[PDB]
Amino acid sequence: PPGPPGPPGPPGPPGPRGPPGXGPPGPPGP
């Protein structure tokens, strides 16, 4: 018969970079 199965493969590659983040209004003028 065939031999036993081989080993699991390696982890896949990293996922893509996330989306850009979301700043507040600037300071008031004096």
Place this chain on the structure above:
Amino acid sequence: PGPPGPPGPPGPPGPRGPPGXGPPGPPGPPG
């Protein structure tokens, strides 16, 4: 004597991607 066994199963997913790179807010109100 028999032939090679089947390939192994797929690996797990890769790691989550890195965090993204936000824009400035609007100008402040007038004084």
Place this chain on the structure above:
Amino acid sequence: PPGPPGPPGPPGPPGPRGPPGXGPPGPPGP
């Protein structure tokens, strides 16, 4: 007798997309 243990499995899929990034305050008002 059985054959040899089999070849390596394939890589997993890509990981999930990253989270959103972290912006600055806007410019001061006039």
